[PDB]
Structure formats: structure tokens, C-alpha cells
């Protein structure tokens, strides 16, 4: 781990890092949220903001110091603060931003700023490619409703990594957590669909646990079976 101001950065692969930021949730402590940073040749791609604009600007500062290449785009994985709270910092920096169309629709009511561009998805869950131009190795998949109605997931081609966002918890998790906007009926199937979309991913990254094996997916789905 690298502590950089109030954030933590961890290299996961030669061209992939996890960013971690924290917010006090009165009654729950200082809650960590993870996202990703990917170098694709001469540019950088970001998955998820930090909780705040100031923290997100710090992610960009870390990128400047540790990678020193332009950030071509960011994709955010649903309309909650941990994933979209720093949109204005991305826009101030001139970075093109993307989210599920449904996340952009929900953003104002959730207290978020919408991304500039909307992703749409085929019936099988894969992003419609025209809506995710220049995404390089980022493979975006809508697994179905689960943690939220709008949650999306991202695989990183050329690596063994897939990012479940807030949909997936690690294999030792006692409970799922953060179920306020969850689709309890469909959660298990959506977790399993994420796994099936990225069958070769042996490192599962997620918002509220450290990286784990694919047991994160099976355990999450088994936990979600109890919601039905
Ligand atoms: Zn959430
Ligand atoms: Zn979350």
C-alpha cells in the first residue's frame, strides 16, 4: 500500500492500481471505497471516482506523479457517492466521463452530478460498443440489478482482473452490506452473471473489500441466495 494524503493506492498488476478513499458514515465509521486506475499505452483510464471532489483531484495528482500520462476517460459504476461523488473534479480536469444511462438518469435524485456520456447495454449485458468508444481494455458488463438497479462491472483485458464494484464482497464477508437500494430478488443471479461474464478473471476487485479470488463471487451469490 502507498499512503498518499488521505488515500491509499495499491498496484495489482503491471498496468493496474487500486485507489481507496474514505468517508465518515455516522453510525458506521470511516468507510473505504475502492476503484481502479489502468494504464493503456500512452493514456490512463479510471474506474470510479473517490467519495469527494477533493479526494478525486488527489487521485489525479497521484496519477500525475506515478504515471504522468493523460487520463483519457473515467467510467463510474453506479449513482452512489462512493462511485460518482467526484464527478465535478473529473470534469474540471477535462476528463471524458461515462456511466450507465440509468446511473445518469438517477444521478440528480441521488445527489450526484451525471457523467457526460451514457452507456447502454445489449440484452445479454455487454455494453453496446458505440457507447463506450476508446475504452481499450475495459470490458463493461451490466450483470442485472443487484446492489442497485444500475450497477455495472468492468473486466480488464490483458489481465486476470475483473471489477465487481459494490455488487461483490469478499469470501470472508459476514454479510453483503449497503442493501438500501438493492434488488433482493435478482441479486444472486446478477452476482453469478458477473462471474460468468469474466470467466478467466482470477483476481476479483470490489468496492468494499480487498481483492480476492473468485470465491468472492461464489460467496456473495450464496449470501444473496438468503435475500430471496
Ligand atoms: Zn452503492
Ligand atoms: Zn459502495
Swiss-Prot record:
Residues reported to bind Zn(2+) 1: 78, 80, 147
Keywords of this entry: Antibiotic resistance, Hydrolase, Metal-binding, Periplasm, Plasmid, Signal, Zinc
GO cellular component term of the entry, any: periplasmic space
Catalyzed reactions: a beta-lactam + H2O = a substituted beta-amino acid
Activity-regulation annotation: Inhibits by captopril, thiorphan, dimercaprol and tiopronin. This enzyme is not susceptible to inactivation by the beta-lactamase-blocking agents clavulanic acid.
GO molecular function, one term: beta-lactamase activity
Chain residues that bind substrate: 169, 178
Annotated Zn(2+) 2 binding sites: 82, 166, 208
GO biological processes: antibiotic catabolic process; response to antibiotic
EC number: 3.5.2.6
This protein's record includes keyword Zinc: yes
Protein's cellular compartments: Periplasm
Cofactor: Zn(2+)
Protein family: Belongs to the metallo-beta-lactamase superfamily. Class-B beta-lactamase family.
Function statement: Confers resistance to the different beta-lactams antibiotics (penicillin, cephalosporin and carbapenem) via the hydrolysis of the beta-lactam ring. Does not confer resistance to the polymixin colistin or the fluoroquinolone ciprofloxacin.
Note: Enterobacteriaceae carrying this gene (identified by PCR) have been isolated in Sweden, India, Pakistan, Bangladesh, England, Scotland, Northern Ireland, Australia and the USA. The organisms they were identified in were K.pneumoniae, Enterobacter cloacae, E.coli, Proteus spp, Citrobacter freundii, Morganella morganii, Providencia spp and Klebsille oxytoca. In India most isolates were from community-acquired infections rather than hospital-acquired infections, indicating the gene is widespread in the environment.
Name by which UniProt lists this protein: Metallo-beta-lactamase type 2
Species this chain originates from: Klebsiella pneumoniae
Amino acid at each position: 500500500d502507498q499512503r498518499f494524503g488521505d488515500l491509499v493506492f495499491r498496484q495489482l498488476a503491471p498496468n493496474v492500481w487500486q485507489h481507496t478513499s474514505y468517508l465518515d458514515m455516522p453510525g458506521f465509521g470511516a468507510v473505504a471505497s475502492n476503484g481502479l486506475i489502468v494504464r493503456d499505452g500512452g493514456r490512463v483510464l479510471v474506474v470510479d471516482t473517490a467519495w469527494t471532489d477533493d479526494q478525486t483531484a488527489q487521485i489525479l495528482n497521484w496519477i500525475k506523479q506515478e504515471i504522468n500520462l493523460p487520463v483519457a476517460l473515467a467510467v463510474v459504476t453506479h449513482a452512489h457517492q462512493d462511485k460518482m461523488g467526484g464527478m465535478d473534479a473529473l470534469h474540471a480536469a477535462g476528463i471524458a466521463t461515462y456511466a450507465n444511462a440509468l446511473s445518469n438518469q438517477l444521478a440528480p435524485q441521488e445527489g450526484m452530478v451525471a457523467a457526460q456520456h451514457s452507456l447502454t447495454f445489449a440484452a445479454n449485458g455487454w455494453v453496446e460498443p458505440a457507447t463506450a468508444p476508446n475504452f481499450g481494455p475495459l470490458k463493461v458488463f451490466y450483470p442485472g440489478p443487484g446492489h442497485t438497479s444500475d450497477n455495472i462491472t468492468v473486466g480488464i483485458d490483458g489481465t486476470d482482473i475483473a471489477f465487481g464494484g459494490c455488487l461483490i464482497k469478499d469470501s470472508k464477508a459476514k454479510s453483503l452490506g449497503n442493501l438500501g437500494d438493492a434488488d433482493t430478488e435478482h441479486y444472486a443471479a446478477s452476482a453469478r452473471a458477473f462471474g460468468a461474464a469474466f470467466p478467466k478473471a482470477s483476481m476479483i476487485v470490489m468496492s468494499h473489500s480487498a481483492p480476492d479470488s473468485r470465491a468472492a463471487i461464489t460467496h456473495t451469490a450464496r449470501m444473496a441466495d438468503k435475500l430471496r
